[PDB]
RNA sequence: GUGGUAAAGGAUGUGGCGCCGCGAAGACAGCCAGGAGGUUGGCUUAGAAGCAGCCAUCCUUUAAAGAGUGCGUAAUAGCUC
RNA sequence: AUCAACGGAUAAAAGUUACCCCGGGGAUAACAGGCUGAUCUCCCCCGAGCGUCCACAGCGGCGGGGAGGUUUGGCACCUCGAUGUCGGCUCGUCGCAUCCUGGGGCUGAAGAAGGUCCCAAGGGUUGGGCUGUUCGCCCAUUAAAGCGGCACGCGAGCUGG
RNA sequence: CGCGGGGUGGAGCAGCCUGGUAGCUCGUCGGGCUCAUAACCCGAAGGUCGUCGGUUCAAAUCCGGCCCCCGCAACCA
């Protein structure tokens, strides 16, 4: 769930399904990369022509594969770790992202539009 | 502007100050912090 | 209006200078001239890129081995101090280019 | 600078007390029991002087440059027999008469004298005409 | 809280000391009205005809006689002194 | 007779040791201590001449005074019957002349932004990139990302390049 | 911060260290060989000897410290 640099799944606008991470985005000390958060990271894997290409980027969480809790104690695990991508402060580059409904995601409520864009199966 | 030193009546006419033991000068202009203290 | 130029160890530098009219020579000197420092330094020569506007200059804009033979010899220190000191005279000269333009233009 | 064509290469030392005297020209200064003063500083006086006297009010300077000093070479260690050179000073002990006549008149000097007074590494004092002297 | 290891230079610190402004036909103020009456620039005149960058070296009043210290630009005002 | 390393051991004479030994001694270093404070680190002082009207917002040329004692050393009496001499992690802690947060001053201050100047340690004050490195460059930064103390904190707790 | 090496006609060094005196080379001015140029034939020309302040009846010189260039030096700490 938490990460400095690591292998973490991008599943977004990279030309391949991975991004290397860099770290947590806000509190100096924190270590832990909690969900519902934006992050610094980079792809390591390849692309088909595409656009985003190699370089550096700042962007956000999806899932965890390491224990959430809800205030209503809803719970939901997943042996996989995709996470969101963003341009600028906020807006989402790719207008495409396959993914499901899910819970914690919108709850930061800084980026409501996304929710529509990744609703589906698998 | 608490200068360390000097102080020589630079808002032209100016009052020598004696307070808290500390000794200064103020005149008509704030742009005259002659506190060598 | 004249033609206020600039200086930078090399010559001609990027591509500034226009027409310094009404003391406009130094007017912007301490401004544009002091272009921070080209953001990039490149080497430890410390070239002095002045402003050859049209004078008569105007504007006014290294390893650490020395301390290792510690605790003594204000002698041998000097010995190894001259070694590199000679490079500077043979660097800035041979080290052509030394022009890191295309920075910010400010 | 102000020295030349030396008899030697290095004086010895001393400093205890001496004697200068009356002003030449009814404007001047004087001090206390000075340590030696470097020529730049010595020349700095007139240097400090020139700007202020109507930025032109002509004045005779004063005392002549003297003694050698050096850190041998630099800061290695003693090994030198005692040599090499750079800077020069003045014999300075009873509070020597400073020379300050001009005709440039009044305070303009008198504070330049304070300029001078604030200048130079010894507390001083301020003088002018007083009580003559006479010589054969 | 000076005794209590520091210079420089500041210092209407304070003390007493000698040297010089008491003008009781009475002052320096602190005050209050005046705070000049022909007291207005030939060189900027972009205005200075004190009160930006350019002279002050003779009379009128005597209330005093600011050649003008002042804040600043359309001169100027307008407040100090 | 230069026996002139000139009161001369011979009449005729080199080095090298990190393969060394063995004696003795703090009557000579290295790290360290301390010493004074030279150079450094910092703070004032004078005020040029600047910086739309400016000497003293901003600065500071030419200068001076220092203080302070971490680097440079000079020193060299503690000592050679044992002062184990680099960084690193550990856990600290004083100190502030502050680096972020206090509170002001001041603006060449519309204000926010800032700059600059006082007064004050409660805290707090990152992870990596790569080399023996502190240091330094850099990458994202994040309220911020400070010096320096204390035998260059720290071998009877190590690391060990 | 020492040393030891020396600074010379346009350039090149000879020549000096052994007090009263600089020479050898091209290149060089003008001149011969030529369709033109080279070749090749000739002339003449021209030197505070890095400074300096001194010894010296006199100093390129002897001698001294300042000025550039060469090389040796710069230990285990």
From Swiss-Prot, chain A:
The keyword Electron transport does not apply. Gene3D superfamilies: Ribosomal protein L14. CDD domains: Ribosomal_uL14. PROSITE patterns: RIBOSOMAL_L14. GO terms for biological process: translation. GO terms for molecular function: large ribosomal subunit rRNA binding; structural constituent of ribosome. The keyword Translocase does not apply. Pfam families: Ribosomal_L14. GO terms for cellular component: cytosolic large ribosomal subunit. HAMAP family: Ribosomal_uL14. Binds to 23S rRNA. Forms part of two intersubunit bridges in the 70S ribosome. Belongs to the universal ribosomal protein uL14 family. Part of the 50S ribosomal subunit. Forms a cluster with proteins L3 and L19. In the 70S ribosome, L14 and L19 interact and together make contacts with the 16S rRNA in bridges B5 and B8. This is Large ribosomal subunit protein uL14.
Curated annotation (Swiss-Prot), chain B:
This is Large ribosomal subunit protein bL36. Keywords: Metal-binding, Ribonucleoprotein, Ribosomal protein, Zinc. Zn(2+) binds at residues 11, 14, 27, 32. It comes from Thermus thermophilus (strain ATCC 27634 / DSM 579 / HB8). One of its GO terms (biological process) is translation. GO terms for molecular function: metal ion binding; structural constituent of ribosome. Part of the 50S ribosomal subunit. Binds 1 zinc ion per subunit.
From Swiss-Prot, chain C:
Required for accurate and efficient protein synthesis under certain stress conditions. May act as a fidelity factor of the translation reaction, by catalyzing a one-codon backward translocation of tRNAs on improperly translocated ribosomes. Back-translocation proceeds from a post-translocation (POST) complex to a pre-translocation (PRE) complex, thus giving elongation factor G a second chance to translocate the tRNAs correctly. Binds to ribosomes in a GTP-dependent manner. Belongs to the TRAFAC class translation factor GTPase superfamily. Classic translation factor GTPase family. LepA subfamily. This is Elongation factor 4. The chain holds residues 489 to 599 of 610 of the full protein. The gene is lepA. It is found in: Cell inner membrane. Coiled coil: none annotated. The lineage of its organism: Bacteria, Thermotogati, Deinococcota, Deinococci, Thermales.
Curated annotation (Swiss-Prot), chain D:
SUPFAM superfamilies: Ribosomal protein L16p/L10e. The keyword Transport does not apply. The keyword rRNA-binding applies. GO terms for molecular function: rRNA binding; structural constituent of ribosome; tRNA binding. Signal peptide: none annotated. Part of the 50S ribosomal subunit. Belongs to the universal ribosomal protein uL16 family. This is Large ribosomal subunit protein uL16. It comes from Thermus thermophilus (strain ATCC 27634 / DSM 579 / HB8). The gene is rplP.
């Amino acid at each position: 769930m938490i990460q400095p640099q690591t292998y973490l799944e991008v599943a977004d606008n990279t030309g391949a399904r991975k991004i290397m991470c860099i770290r947590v985005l806000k509190g100096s000390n924190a270590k832990y990369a909690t969900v519902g958060d934006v992050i610094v990271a980079s792809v390591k894997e390849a692309i088909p022509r595409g656009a985003v290409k190699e370089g550096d980027v700042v962007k956000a969480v999806v899932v965890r594969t390491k224990k959430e809790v809800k205030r209503p104690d809803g719970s939901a695990i997943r042996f996989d770790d995709n996470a969101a991508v963003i341009i600028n402060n906020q807006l989402e580059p790719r207008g495409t992202r396959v993914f499901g409904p899910v819970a914690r995601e919108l709850r930061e409520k800084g980026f409501m539009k996304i929710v529509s864009l990744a609703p589906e199966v698998l | 502007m608490k200068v360390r030193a000097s102080v020589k009546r630079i808002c032209d006419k100016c009052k020598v100050i004696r307070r808290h033991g500390r000794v200064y000068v103020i005149c008509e202009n704030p742009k005259h912090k002659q506190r060598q203290g | 209006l004249v033609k206020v130029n600039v200086l930078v160890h090399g010559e001609v530098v990027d591509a500034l200078t226009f027409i310094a009219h009404r003391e406009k020579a130094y007017t912007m000197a301490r401004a544009i001239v002091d272009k921070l420092a080209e953001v990039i330094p490149r080497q430890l020569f410390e070239v002095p890129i002045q402003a050859a506007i049209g004078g008569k200059i105007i504007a006014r804009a290294r390893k650490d081995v020395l301390a290792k033979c510690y605790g003594g010899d204000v002698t041998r220190k000097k010995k190894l101090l001259e070694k590199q000191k000679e490079g500077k005279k043979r660097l800035k000269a041979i080290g052509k280019v030394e022009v890191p333009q295309e920075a910010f233009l400010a | 600078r102000m020295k030349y064509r030396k008899q030697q290469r290095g004086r010895l030392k001393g400093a205890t007390k001496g004697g200068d005297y009356v002003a030449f020209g009814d404007y001047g200064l004087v001090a206390l029991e000075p340590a030696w003063i470097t020529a730049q500083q010595i020349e700095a006086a007139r240097v400090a002087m020139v700007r202020h006297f109507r930025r032109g009010g002509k004045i005779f300077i004063r005392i002549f440059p003297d003694k050698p000093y050096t850190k041998k070479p630099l800061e290695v260690r003693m090994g030198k027999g005692k040599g090499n050179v750079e800077g020069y000073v003045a014999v300075v002990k009873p509070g020597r008469v400073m020379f300050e006549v001009a005709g440039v008149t009044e305070e303009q000097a008198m504070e330049a004298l304070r300029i001078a007074g604030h200048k130079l590494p010894i507390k001083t004092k301020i003088v002018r005409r007083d009580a003559y002297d006479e010589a054969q």
